Amino acid sequence: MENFQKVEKIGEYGVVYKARNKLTGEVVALKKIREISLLKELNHPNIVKLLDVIHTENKLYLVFEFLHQDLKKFMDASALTGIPLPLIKSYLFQLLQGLAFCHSHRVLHRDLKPQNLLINTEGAIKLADFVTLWYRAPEILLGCKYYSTAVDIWSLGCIFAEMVTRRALFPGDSEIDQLFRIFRTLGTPDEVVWPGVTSMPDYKPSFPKWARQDFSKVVPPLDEDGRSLLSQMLHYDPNKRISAKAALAHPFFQDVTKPVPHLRL
Ligand SMILES: CC(C)(C)c1cnc(CSc2cnc(NC(=O)C3CCNCC3)s2)o1
Structure with missing residues:
Protein backbone atom coordinates (compact mmCIF):
# COMPACT_ATOMS: atom_id res chain seq x y z
CA MET A 1 0.00 0.00 0.00
CA GLN A 69 -15.11 10.21 -16.82
CA ASP A 70 -18.09 7.86 -16.30
CA LEU A 71 -21.21 7.52 -18.50
CA LYS A 72 -23.63 8.72 -15.77
CA LYS A 73 -21.84 12.09 -15.45
CA PHE A 74 -21.51 12.35 -19.25
CA MET A 75 -25.29 11.72 -19.71
CA ASP A 76 -26.02 14.31 -16.97
CA ALA A 77 -23.68 16.81 -18.78
CA SER A 78 -25.38 15.99 -22.16
CA ALA A 79 -29.04 16.08 -20.89
CA LEU A 80 -30.03 19.41 -22.55
CA THR A 81 -29.16 18.35 -26.15
CA GLY A 82 -28.71 14.60 -25.68
CA ILE A 83 -25.77 12.41 -26.73
CA PRO A 84 -25.56 12.42 -30.57
CA LEU A 85 -26.92 9.21 -32.13
CA PRO A 86 -23.53 8.31 -33.82
CA LEU A 87 -21.86 8.45 -30.33
CA ILE A 88 -24.71 6.37 -28.69
CA LYS A 89 -24.18 3.82 -31.49
CA SER A 90 -20.39 3.78 -31.02
CA TYR A 91 -20.66 3.27 -27.23
CA LEU A 92 -23.31 0.53 -27.66
CA PHE A 93 -21.16 -1.26 -30.28
CA GLN A 94 -18.01 -1.10 -28.09
CA LEU A 95 -19.82 -2.41 -24.95
CA LEU A 96 -21.29 -5.28 -27.03
CA GLN A 97 -17.67 -6.06 -28.15
CA GLY A 98 -16.54 -6.01 -24.45
CA LEU A 99 -19.44 -8.28 -23.41
CA ALA A 100 -18.97 -10.66 -26.38
CA PHE A 101 -15.35 -11.07 -25.12
CA CYS A 102 -16.33 -11.54 -21.42
CA HIS A 103 -19.20 -13.90 -22.28
CA SER A 104 -16.97 -16.12 -24.51
CA HIS A 105 -14.69 -16.59 -21.38
CA ARG A 106 -17.81 -17.49 -19.28
CA VAL A 107 -17.41 -14.21 -17.30
CA LEU A 108 -20.55 -12.19 -16.42
CA HIS A 109 -20.56 -8.55 -15.31
CA ARG A 110 -23.93 -8.88 -13.35
CA ASP A 111 -24.24 -5.19 -12.39
CA LEU A 112 -23.91 -2.96 -15.48
CA LYS A 113 -24.97 0.63 -14.87
CA PRO A 114 -23.94 4.07 -16.24
CA GLN A 115 -21.85 4.74 -13.04
CA ASN A 116 -19.50 1.84 -13.88
CA LEU A 117 -19.06 2.53 -17.65
CA LEU A 118 -15.90 4.61 -18.07
CA ILE A 119 -14.98 6.85 -20.98
CA ASN A 120 -11.87 8.62 -22.35
CA THR A 121 -11.11 11.56 -24.75
CA GLU A 122 -10.41 9.09 -27.59
CA GLY A 123 -14.00 7.87 -27.96
CA ALA A 124 -13.54 4.64 -26.01
CA ILE A 125 -15.95 3.23 -23.40
CA LYS A 126 -14.97 0.45 -20.97
CA LEU A 127 -16.60 -2.06 -18.64
CA ALA A 128 -15.52 -1.65 -14.96
CA ASP A 129 -16.47 -2.94 -11.43
CA PHE A 130 -17.21 -6.60 -12.33
CA VAL A 131 -28.60 -0.37 -4.26
CA THR A 132 -29.68 0.63 -7.81
CA LEU A 133 -32.22 -1.88 -9.24
CA TRP A 134 -32.95 0.03 -12.50
CA TYR A 135 -30.80 -2.22 -14.73
CA ARG A 136 -31.59 -5.59 -13.11
CA ALA A 137 -32.84 -8.41 -15.47
CA PRO A 138 -36.31 -9.86 -14.65
CA GLU A 139 -34.92 -13.39 -14.04
CA ILE A 140 -32.75 -11.95 -11.19
CA LEU A 141 -35.76 -10.13 -9.66
CA LEU A 142 -37.82 -13.38 -9.91
CA GLY A 143 -35.17 -15.33 -7.88
CA CYS A 144 -33.23 -17.28 -10.53
CA LYS A 145 -29.90 -18.15 -8.86
CA TYR A 146 -28.16 -19.65 -11.93
CA TYR A 147 -28.79 -16.78 -14.35
CA SER A 148 -26.79 -16.36 -17.59
CA THR A 149 -24.83 -13.87 -19.68
CA ALA A 150 -28.31 -12.65 -20.91
CA VAL A 151 -28.56 -10.55 -17.68
CA ASP A 152 -25.81 -8.24 -19.07
CA ILE A 153 -27.67 -7.79 -22.44
CA TRP A 154 -30.80 -6.70 -20.47
CA SER A 155 -28.79 -4.12 -18.43
CA LEU A 156 -27.13 -2.81 -21.63
CA GLY A 157 -30.56 -2.53 -23.33
CA CYS A 158 -31.81 -0.42 -20.40
CA ILE A 159 -28.70 1.82 -20.69
CA PHE A 160 -29.20 2.13 -24.50
CA ALA A 161 -32.85 3.31 -23.93
CA GLU A 162 -31.65 5.85 -21.30
CA MET A 163 -28.98 7.34 -23.61
CA VAL A 164 -31.64 7.79 -26.34
CA THR A 165 -34.45 9.29 -24.19
CA ARG A 166 -32.46 11.04 -21.42
CA ARG A 167 -34.64 9.26 -18.83
CA ALA A 168 -34.19 5.94 -16.96
CA LEU A 169 -36.28 3.20 -18.61
CA PHE A 170 -37.32 1.35 -15.39
CA PRO A 171 -36.51 3.53 -12.35
CA GLY A 172 -37.73 1.26 -9.52
CA ASP A 173 -37.12 1.96 -5.83
CA SER A 174 -37.81 -1.62 -4.57
CA GLU A 175 -37.57 -5.12 -6.07
CA ILE A 176 -41.35 -5.35 -6.56
CA ASP A 177 -41.58 -1.70 -7.86
CA GLN A 178 -38.76 -2.58 -10.37
CA LEU A 179 -40.58 -5.78 -11.42
CA PHE A 180 -43.96 -3.96 -11.74
CA ARG A 181 -42.41 -1.07 -13.77
CA ILE A 182 -41.01 -3.68 -16.25
CA PHE A 183 -44.42 -5.45 -16.37
CA ARG A 184 -46.28 -2.14 -16.97
CA THR A 185 -44.12 -1.43 -20.05
CA LEU A 186 -43.42 -4.88 -21.52
CA GLY A 187 -46.57 -6.66 -20.28
CA THR A 188 -46.82 -9.16 -17.37
CA PRO A 189 -44.87 -12.20 -18.65
CA ASP A 190 -46.68 -15.54 -19.00
CA GLU A 191 -45.90 -19.07 -20.25
CA VAL A 192 -46.51 -18.00 -23.89
CA VAL A 193 -43.72 -15.38 -23.98
CA TRP A 194 -41.57 -16.89 -21.20
CA PRO A 195 -41.84 -20.70 -20.72
CA GLY A 196 -41.02 -21.62 -17.16
CA VAL A 197 -41.78 -18.12 -15.78
CA THR A 198 -44.66 -19.32 -13.53
CA SER A 199 -42.28 -21.76 -11.81
CA MET A 200 -39.58 -19.08 -10.99
CA PRO A 201 -38.84 -18.88 -7.18
CA ASP A 202 -40.46 -15.46 -6.56
CA TYR A 203 -43.13 -15.57 -9.26
CA LYS A 204 -46.63 -15.05 -7.80
CA PRO A 205 -49.86 -16.04 -9.62
CA SER A 206 -51.28 -12.97 -7.81
CA PHE A 207 -49.09 -10.52 -9.80
CA PRO A 208 -51.30 -8.02 -11.69
CA LYS A 209 -51.79 -8.68 -15.41
CA TRP A 210 -50.73 -5.66 -17.52
CA ALA A 211 -50.76 -5.52 -21.35
CA ARG A 212 -47.62 -4.73 -23.38
CA GLN A 213 -47.01 -1.14 -24.69
CA ASP A 214 -45.59 -0.38 -28.22
CA PHE A 215 -41.81 0.50 -28.38
CA SER A 216 -42.66 3.57 -30.54
CA LYS A 217 -44.02 5.08 -27.26
CA VAL A 218 -41.17 3.75 -25.05
CA VAL A 219 -38.08 5.12 -26.91
CA PRO A 220 -38.99 8.04 -29.30
CA PRO A 221 -37.13 9.18 -31.50
CA LEU A 222 -35.18 5.94 -31.94
CA ASP A 223 -35.33 4.66 -35.52
CA GLU A 224 -36.78 1.26 -36.53
CA ASP A 225 -33.38 -0.46 -36.57
CA GLY A 226 -32.59 0.76 -33.02
CA ARG A 227 -36.08 -0.19 -31.72
CA SER A 228 -35.78 -3.66 -33.29
CA LEU A 229 -32.34 -4.22 -31.61
CA LEU A 230 -33.64 -2.86 -28.27
CA SER A 231 -36.71 -5.21 -28.39
CA GLN A 232 -34.35 -8.17 -28.84
CA MET A 233 -32.15 -7.04 -25.87
CA LEU A 234 -35.34 -6.79 -23.73
CA HIS A 235 -36.91 -10.20 -24.49
CA TYR A 236 -38.25 -11.70 -21.20
CA ASP A 237 -37.02 -15.20 -22.01
CA PRO A 238 -33.22 -15.19 -21.36
CA ASN A 239 -32.91 -17.96 -23.97
CA LYS A 240 -34.64 -15.72 -26.61
CA ARG A 241 -32.74 -12.52 -25.58
CA ILE A 242 -30.15 -11.60 -28.24
CA SER A 243 -26.47 -12.50 -27.51
CA ALA A 244 -23.72 -9.82 -27.60
CA LYS A 245 -22.17 -11.55 -30.70
CA ALA A 246 -25.47 -11.64 -32.65
CA ALA A 247 -26.28 -8.03 -31.62
CA LEU A 248 -22.98 -6.87 -33.25
CA ALA A 249 -24.35 -8.15 -36.63
CA HIS A 250 -27.67 -6.27 -36.25
CA PRO A 251 -28.54 -3.83 -39.16
CA PHE A 252 -28.46 -0.92 -36.63
CA PHE A 253 -24.61 -1.11 -36.75
CA GLN A 254 -24.31 -1.04 -40.59
CA ASP A 255 -23.15 2.66 -40.40
CA VAL A 256 -21.33 2.51 -37.02
CA THR A 257 -18.37 4.97 -36.64
CA LYS A 258 -16.12 6.07 -33.78
CA PRO A 259 -16.84 9.76 -33.01
CA VAL A 260 -14.83 11.77 -30.45
CA PRO A 261 -17.00 13.08 -27.52
CA HIS A 262 -16.89 16.63 -26.06
CA LEU A 263 -15.24 16.00 -22.66
CA ARG A 264 -14.78 18.90 -20.17
CA LEU A 265 -12.30 17.57 -17.55
C1 LIG B 1 -17.52 2.10 -8.98
C2 LIG B 1 -16.28 2.56 -9.74
C3 LIG B 1 -15.68 3.77 -9.02
C4 LIG B 1 -16.71 2.96 -11.15
C5 LIG B 1 -15.25 1.43 -9.81
C6 LIG B 1 -14.95 0.25 -9.14
N1 LIG B 1 -13.91 -0.40 -9.77
C7 LIG B 1 -13.59 0.40 -10.81
C8 LIG B 1 -12.54 0.31 -11.85
S1 LIG B 1 -11.24 1.45 -11.35
C9 LIG B 1 -11.45 2.95 -12.23
C10 LIG B 1 -10.77 3.44 -13.29
N2 LIG B 1 -11.00 4.76 -13.62
C11 LIG B 1 -11.90 5.26 -12.81
N3 LIG B 1 -12.32 6.56 -12.97
C12 LIG B 1 -13.33 7.14 -12.27
O1 LIG B 1 -13.94 6.55 -11.38
C13 LIG B 1 -13.68 8.54 -12.67
C14 LIG B 1 -13.00 9.55 -11.72
C15 LIG B 1 -13.45 10.96 -12.02
N4 LIG B 1 -14.92 11.04 -11.92
C16 LIG B 1 -15.55 10.19 -12.96
C17 LIG B 1 -15.20 8.75 -12.66
S2 LIG B 1 -12.52 4.18 -11.61
O2 LIG B 1 -14.36 1.52 -10.87
Missing part, protein backbone atom coordinates in the same frame (compact mmCIF):
# COMPACT_ATOMS: atom_id res chain seq x y z
CA GLU A 2 2.91 2.43 0.86
CA ASN A 3 4.00 2.42 -2.85
CA PHE A 4 0.91 4.56 -3.70
CA GLN A 5 0.07 8.19 -2.87
CA LYS A 6 -3.73 8.50 -2.69
CA VAL A 7 -4.88 11.79 -4.30
CA GLU A 8 -8.73 11.67 -3.99
CA LYS A 9 -11.62 9.29 -3.24
CA ILE A 10 -13.45 8.64 -6.55
CA GLY A 11 -16.25 6.40 -5.12
CA GLU A 12 -17.54 2.75 -5.24
CA TYR A 13 -17.17 -4.19 -2.50
CA GLY A 14 -14.66 -1.52 -1.37
CA VAL A 15 -13.43 2.08 -1.85
CA VAL A 16 -11.75 3.54 -5.02
CA TYR A 17 -9.08 6.29 -4.98
CA LYS A 18 -7.25 8.13 -7.78
CA ALA A 19 -3.57 7.59 -6.81
CA ARG A 20 0.01 7.93 -8.01
CA ASN A 21 2.40 4.95 -8.19
CA LYS A 22 5.56 6.31 -6.41
CA LEU A 23 7.67 3.70 -8.38
CA THR A 24 6.40 3.93 -12.03
CA GLY A 25 5.01 7.49 -11.77
CA GLU A 26 1.68 6.25 -13.19
CA VAL A 27 -1.69 7.77 -12.19
CA VAL A 28 -3.99 4.78 -11.49
CA ALA A 29 -7.31 3.96 -9.76
CA LEU A 30 -6.67 1.99 -6.52
CA LYS A 31 -9.50 -0.12 -5.13
CA LYS A 32 -9.24 -1.18 -1.42
CA ILE A 33 -11.31 -4.38 -0.86
CA ARG A 34 -7.37 -17.25 -7.74
CA GLU A 35 -10.58 -15.70 -9.29
CA ILE A 36 -8.99 -12.19 -9.18
CA SER A 37 -5.61 -13.42 -10.62
CA LEU A 38 -7.75 -14.95 -13.45
CA LEU A 39 -9.40 -11.53 -14.21
CA LYS A 40 -5.87 -10.03 -14.67
CA GLU A 41 -5.54 -12.11 -17.90
CA LEU A 42 -9.01 -11.03 -19.20
CA ASN A 43 -7.59 -8.19 -21.40
CA HIS A 44 -9.69 -6.28 -24.01
CA PRO A 45 -9.84 -2.60 -25.30
CA ASN A 46 -13.37 -2.28 -23.79
CA ILE A 47 -12.52 -3.68 -20.33
CA VAL A 48 -10.74 -1.38 -17.80
CA LYS A 49 -7.27 -2.93 -17.43
CA LEU A 50 -6.41 -4.46 -14.06
CA LEU A 51 -2.69 -3.65 -13.82
CA ASP A 52 -1.80 -5.33 -10.49
CA VAL A 53 -3.31 -7.29 -7.57
CA ILE A 54 -1.70 -6.62 -4.14
CA HIS A 55 -2.41 -9.12 -1.38
CA THR A 56 -0.54 -7.67 1.69
CA GLU A 57 -1.56 -7.62 5.42
CA ASN A 58 -4.97 -9.42 4.94
CA LYS A 59 -6.60 -6.66 2.75
CA LEU A 60 -6.58 -6.73 -1.08
CA TYR A 61 -5.72 -3.73 -3.33
CA LEU A 62 -6.61 -3.76 -7.05
CA VAL A 63 -4.65 -1.36 -9.28
CA PHE A 64 -6.48 -0.33 -12.47
CA GLU A 65 -5.75 2.00 -15.35
CA PHE A 66 -7.46 5.34 -14.65
CA LEU A 67 -10.28 6.79 -16.88
CA HIS A 68 -11.33 10.43 -16.50
Whole structure:
Protein backbone atom coordinates (compact mmCIF):
# COMPACT_ATOMS: atom_id res chain seq x y z
CA MET A 1 0.00 0.00 0.00
CA GLU A 2 2.91 2.43 0.86
CA ASN A 3 4.00 2.42 -2.85
CA PHE A 4 0.91 4.56 -3.70
CA GLN A 5 0.07 8.19 -2.87
CA LYS A 6 -3.73 8.50 -2.69
CA VAL A 7 -4.88 11.79 -4.30
CA GLU A 8 -8.73 11.67 -3.99
CA LYS A 9 -11.62 9.29 -3.24
CA ILE A 10 -13.45 8.64 -6.55
CA GLY A 11 -16.25 6.40 -5.12
CA GLU A 12 -17.54 2.75 -5.24
CA TYR A 13 -17.17 -4.19 -2.50
CA GLY A 14 -14.66 -1.52 -1.37
CA VAL A 15 -13.43 2.08 -1.85
CA VAL A 16 -11.75 3.54 -5.02
CA TYR A 17 -9.08 6.29 -4.98
CA LYS A 18 -7.25 8.13 -7.78
CA ALA A 19 -3.57 7.59 -6.81
CA ARG A 20 0.01 7.93 -8.01
CA ASN A 21 2.40 4.95 -8.19
CA LYS A 22 5.56 6.31 -6.41
CA LEU A 23 7.67 3.70 -8.38
CA THR A 24 6.40 3.93 -12.03
CA GLY A 25 5.01 7.49 -11.77
CA GLU A 26 1.68 6.25 -13.19
CA VAL A 27 -1.69 7.77 -12.19
CA VAL A 28 -3.99 4.78 -11.49
CA ALA A 29 -7.31 3.96 -9.76
CA LEU A 30 -6.67 1.99 -6.52
CA LYS A 31 -9.50 -0.12 -5.13
CA LYS A 32 -9.24 -1.18 -1.42
CA ILE A 33 -11.31 -4.38 -0.86
CA ARG A 34 -7.37 -17.25 -7.74
CA GLU A 35 -10.58 -15.70 -9.29
CA ILE A 36 -8.99 -12.19 -9.18
CA SER A 37 -5.61 -13.42 -10.62
CA LEU A 38 -7.75 -14.95 -13.45
CA LEU A 39 -9.40 -11.53 -14.21
CA LYS A 40 -5.87 -10.03 -14.67
CA GLU A 41 -5.54 -12.11 -17.90
CA LEU A 42 -9.01 -11.03 -19.20
CA ASN A 43 -7.59 -8.19 -21.40
CA HIS A 44 -9.69 -6.28 -24.01
CA PRO A 45 -9.84 -2.60 -25.30
CA ASN A 46 -13.37 -2.28 -23.79
CA ILE A 47 -12.52 -3.68 -20.33
CA VAL A 48 -10.74 -1.38 -17.80
CA LYS A 49 -7.27 -2.93 -17.43
CA LEU A 50 -6.41 -4.46 -14.06
CA LEU A 51 -2.69 -3.65 -13.82
CA ASP A 52 -1.80 -5.33 -10.49
CA VAL A 53 -3.31 -7.29 -7.57
CA ILE A 54 -1.70 -6.62 -4.14
CA HIS A 55 -2.41 -9.12 -1.38
CA THR A 56 -0.54 -7.67 1.69
CA GLU A 57 -1.56 -7.62 5.42
CA ASN A 58 -4.97 -9.42 4.94
CA LYS A 59 -6.60 -6.66 2.75
CA LEU A 60 -6.58 -6.73 -1.08
CA TYR A 61 -5.72 -3.73 -3.33
CA LEU A 62 -6.61 -3.76 -7.05
CA VAL A 63 -4.65 -1.36 -9.28
CA PHE A 64 -6.48 -0.33 -12.47
CA GLU A 65 -5.75 2.00 -15.35
CA PHE A 66 -7.46 5.34 -14.65
CA LEU A 67 -10.28 6.79 -16.88
CA HIS A 68 -11.33 10.43 -16.50
CA GLN A 69 -15.11 10.21 -16.82
CA ASP A 70 -18.09 7.86 -16.30
CA LEU A 71 -21.21 7.52 -18.50
CA LYS A 72 -23.63 8.72 -15.77
CA LYS A 73 -21.84 12.09 -15.45
CA PHE A 74 -21.51 12.35 -19.25
CA MET A 75 -25.29 11.72 -19.71
CA ASP A 76 -26.02 14.31 -16.97
CA ALA A 77 -23.68 16.81 -18.78
CA SER A 78 -25.38 15.99 -22.16
CA ALA A 79 -29.04 16.08 -20.89
CA LEU A 80 -30.03 19.41 -22.55
CA THR A 81 -29.16 18.35 -26.15
CA GLY A 82 -28.71 14.60 -25.68
CA ILE A 83 -25.77 12.41 -26.73
CA PRO A 84 -25.56 12.42 -30.57
CA LEU A 85 -26.92 9.21 -32.13
CA PRO A 86 -23.53 8.31 -33.82
CA LEU A 87 -21.86 8.45 -30.33
CA ILE A 88 -24.71 6.37 -28.69
CA LYS A 89 -24.18 3.82 -31.49
CA SER A 90 -20.39 3.78 -31.02
CA TYR A 91 -20.66 3.27 -27.23
CA LEU A 92 -23.31 0.53 -27.66
CA PHE A 93 -21.16 -1.26 -30.28
CA GLN A 94 -18.01 -1.10 -28.09
CA LEU A 95 -19.82 -2.41 -24.95
CA LEU A 96 -21.29 -5.28 -27.03
CA GLN A 97 -17.67 -6.06 -28.15
CA GLY A 98 -16.54 -6.01 -24.45
CA LEU A 99 -19.44 -8.28 -23.41
CA ALA A 100 -18.97 -10.66 -26.38
CA PHE A 101 -15.35 -11.07 -25.12
CA CYS A 102 -16.33 -11.54 -21.42
CA HIS A 103 -19.20 -13.90 -22.28
CA SER A 104 -16.97 -16.12 -24.51
CA HIS A 105 -14.69 -16.59 -21.38
CA ARG A 106 -17.81 -17.49 -19.28
CA VAL A 107 -17.41 -14.21 -17.30
CA LEU A 108 -20.55 -12.19 -16.42
CA HIS A 109 -20.56 -8.55 -15.31
CA ARG A 110 -23.93 -8.88 -13.35
CA ASP A 111 -24.24 -5.19 -12.39
CA LEU A 112 -23.91 -2.96 -15.48
CA LYS A 113 -24.97 0.63 -14.87
CA PRO A 114 -23.94 4.07 -16.24
CA GLN A 115 -21.85 4.74 -13.04
CA ASN A 116 -19.50 1.84 -13.88
CA LEU A 117 -19.06 2.53 -17.65
CA LEU A 118 -15.90 4.61 -18.07
CA ILE A 119 -14.98 6.85 -20.98
CA ASN A 120 -11.87 8.62 -22.35
CA THR A 121 -11.11 11.56 -24.75
CA GLU A 122 -10.41 9.09 -27.59
CA GLY A 123 -14.00 7.87 -27.96
CA ALA A 124 -13.54 4.64 -26.01
CA ILE A 125 -15.95 3.23 -23.40
CA LYS A 126 -14.97 0.45 -20.97
CA LEU A 127 -16.60 -2.06 -18.64
CA ALA A 128 -15.52 -1.65 -14.96
CA ASP A 129 -16.47 -2.94 -11.43
CA PHE A 130 -17.21 -6.60 -12.33
CA VAL A 131 -28.60 -0.37 -4.26
CA THR A 132 -29.68 0.63 -7.81
CA LEU A 133 -32.22 -1.88 -9.24
CA TRP A 134 -32.95 0.03 -12.50
CA TYR A 135 -30.80 -2.22 -14.73
CA ARG A 136 -31.59 -5.59 -13.11
CA ALA A 137 -32.84 -8.41 -15.47
CA PRO A 138 -36.31 -9.86 -14.65
CA GLU A 139 -34.92 -13.39 -14.04
CA ILE A 140 -32.75 -11.95 -11.19
CA LEU A 141 -35.76 -10.13 -9.66
CA LEU A 142 -37.82 -13.38 -9.91
CA GLY A 143 -35.17 -15.33 -7.88
CA CYS A 144 -33.23 -17.28 -10.53
CA LYS A 145 -29.90 -18.15 -8.86
CA TYR A 146 -28.16 -19.65 -11.93
CA TYR A 147 -28.79 -16.78 -14.35
CA SER A 148 -26.79 -16.36 -17.59
CA THR A 149 -24.83 -13.87 -19.68
CA ALA A 150 -28.31 -12.65 -20.91
CA VAL A 151 -28.56 -10.55 -17.68
CA ASP A 152 -25.81 -8.24 -19.07
CA ILE A 153 -27.67 -7.79 -22.44
CA TRP A 154 -30.80 -6.70 -20.47
CA SER A 155 -28.79 -4.12 -18.43
CA LEU A 156 -27.13 -2.81 -21.63
CA GLY A 157 -30.56 -2.53 -23.33
CA CYS A 158 -31.81 -0.42 -20.40
CA ILE A 159 -28.70 1.82 -20.69
CA PHE A 160 -29.20 2.13 -24.50
CA ALA A 161 -32.85 3.31 -23.93
CA GLU A 162 -31.65 5.85 -21.30
CA MET A 163 -28.98 7.34 -23.61
CA VAL A 164 -31.64 7.79 -26.34
CA THR A 165 -34.45 9.29 -24.19
CA ARG A 166 -32.46 11.04 -21.42
CA ARG A 167 -34.64 9.26 -18.83
CA ALA A 168 -34.19 5.94 -16.96
CA LEU A 169 -36.28 3.20 -18.61
CA PHE A 170 -37.32 1.35 -15.39
CA PRO A 171 -36.51 3.53 -12.35
CA GLY A 172 -37.73 1.26 -9.52
CA ASP A 173 -37.12 1.96 -5.83
CA SER A 174 -37.81 -1.62 -4.57
CA GLU A 175 -37.57 -5.12 -6.07
CA ILE A 176 -41.35 -5.35 -6.56
CA ASP A 177 -41.58 -1.70 -7.86
CA GLN A 178 -38.76 -2.58 -10.37
CA LEU A 179 -40.58 -5.78 -11.42
CA PHE A 180 -43.96 -3.96 -11.74
CA ARG A 181 -42.41 -1.07 -13.77
CA ILE A 182 -41.01 -3.68 -16.25
CA PHE A 183 -44.42 -5.45 -16.37
CA ARG A 184 -46.28 -2.14 -16.97
CA THR A 185 -44.12 -1.43 -20.05
CA LEU A 186 -43.42 -4.88 -21.52
CA GLY A 187 -46.57 -6.66 -20.28
CA THR A 188 -46.82 -9.16 -17.37
CA PRO A 189 -44.87 -12.20 -18.65
CA ASP A 190 -46.68 -15.54 -19.00
CA GLU A 191 -45.90 -19.07 -20.25
CA VAL A 192 -46.51 -18.00 -23.89
CA VAL A 193 -43.72 -15.38 -23.98
CA TRP A 194 -41.57 -16.89 -21.20
CA PRO A 195 -41.84 -20.70 -20.72
CA GLY A 196 -41.02 -21.62 -17.16
CA VAL A 197 -41.78 -18.12 -15.78
CA THR A 198 -44.66 -19.32 -13.53
CA SER A 199 -42.28 -21.76 -11.81
CA MET A 200 -39.58 -19.08 -10.99
CA PRO A 201 -38.84 -18.88 -7.18
CA ASP A 202 -40.46 -15.46 -6.56
CA TYR A 203 -43.13 -15.57 -9.26
CA LYS A 204 -46.63 -15.05 -7.80
CA PRO A 205 -49.86 -16.04 -9.62
CA SER A 206 -51.28 -12.97 -7.81
CA PHE A 207 -49.09 -10.52 -9.80
CA PRO A 208 -51.30 -8.02 -11.69
CA LYS A 209 -51.79 -8.68 -15.41
CA TRP A 210 -50.73 -5.66 -17.52
CA ALA A 211 -50.76 -5.52 -21.35
CA ARG A 212 -47.62 -4.73 -23.38
CA GLN A 213 -47.01 -1.14 -24.69
CA ASP A 214 -45.59 -0.38 -28.22
CA PHE A 215 -41.81 0.50 -28.38
CA SER A 216 -42.66 3.57 -30.54
CA LYS A 217 -44.02 5.08 -27.26
CA VAL A 218 -41.17 3.75 -25.05
CA VAL A 219 -38.08 5.12 -26.91
CA PRO A 220 -38.99 8.04 -29.30
CA PRO A 221 -37.13 9.18 -31.50
CA LEU A 222 -35.18 5.94 -31.94
CA ASP A 223 -35.33 4.66 -35.52
CA GLU A 224 -36.78 1.26 -36.53
CA ASP A 225 -33.38 -0.46 -36.57
CA GLY A 226 -32.59 0.76 -33.02
CA ARG A 227 -36.08 -0.19 -31.72
CA SER A 228 -35.78 -3.66 -33.29
CA LEU A 229 -32.34 -4.22 -31.61
CA LEU A 230 -33.64 -2.86 -28.27
CA SER A 231 -36.71 -5.21 -28.39
CA GLN A 232 -34.35 -8.17 -28.84
CA MET A 233 -32.15 -7.04 -25.87
CA LEU A 234 -35.34 -6.79 -23.73
CA HIS A 235 -36.91 -10.20 -24.49
CA TYR A 236 -38.25 -11.70 -21.20
CA ASP A 237 -37.02 -15.20 -22.01
CA PRO A 238 -33.22 -15.19 -21.36
CA ASN A 239 -32.91 -17.96 -23.97
CA LYS A 240 -34.64 -15.72 -26.61
CA ARG A 241 -32.74 -12.52 -25.58
CA ILE A 242 -30.15 -11.60 -28.24
CA SER A 243 -26.47 -12.50 -27.51
CA ALA A 244 -23.72 -9.82 -27.60
CA LYS A 245 -22.17 -11.55 -30.70
CA ALA A 246 -25.47 -11.64 -32.65
CA ALA A 247 -26.28 -8.03 -31.62
CA LEU A 248 -22.98 -6.87 -33.25
CA ALA A 249 -24.35 -8.15 -36.63
CA HIS A 250 -27.67 -6.27 -36.25
CA PRO A 251 -28.54 -3.83 -39.16
CA PHE A 252 -28.46 -0.92 -36.63
CA PHE A 253 -24.61 -1.11 -36.75
CA GLN A 254 -24.31 -1.04 -40.59
CA ASP A 255 -23.15 2.66 -40.40
CA VAL A 256 -21.33 2.51 -37.02
CA THR A 257 -18.37 4.97 -36.64
CA LYS A 258 -16.12 6.07 -33.78
CA PRO A 259 -16.84 9.76 -33.01
CA VAL A 260 -14.83 11.77 -30.45
CA PRO A 261 -17.00 13.08 -27.52
CA HIS A 262 -16.89 16.63 -26.06
CA LEU A 263 -15.24 16.00 -22.66
CA ARG A 264 -14.78 18.90 -20.17
CA LEU A 265 -12.30 17.57 -17.55
C1 LIG B 1 -17.52 2.10 -8.98
C2 LIG B 1 -16.28 2.56 -9.74
C3 LIG B 1 -15.68 3.77 -9.02
C4 LIG B 1 -16.71 2.96 -11.15
C5 LIG B 1 -15.25 1.43 -9.81
C6 LIG B 1 -14.95 0.25 -9.14
N1 LIG B 1 -13.91 -0.40 -9.77
C7 LIG B 1 -13.59 0.40 -10.81
C8 LIG B 1 -12.54 0.31 -11.85
S1 LIG B 1 -11.24 1.45 -11.35
C9 LIG B 1 -11.45 2.95 -12.23
C10 LIG B 1 -10.77 3.44 -13.29
N2 LIG B 1 -11.00 4.76 -13.62
C11 LIG B 1 -11.90 5.26 -12.81
N3 LIG B 1 -12.32 6.56 -12.97
C12 LIG B 1 -13.33 7.14 -12.27
O1 LIG B 1 -13.94 6.55 -11.38
C13 LIG B 1 -13.68 8.54 -12.67
C14 LIG B 1 -13.00 9.55 -11.72
C15 LIG B 1 -13.45 10.96 -12.02
N4 LIG B 1 -14.92 11.04 -11.92
C16 LIG B 1 -15.55 10.19 -12.96
C17 LIG B 1 -15.20 8.75 -12.66
S2 LIG B 1 -12.52 4.18 -11.61
O2 LIG B 1 -14.36 1.52 -10.87
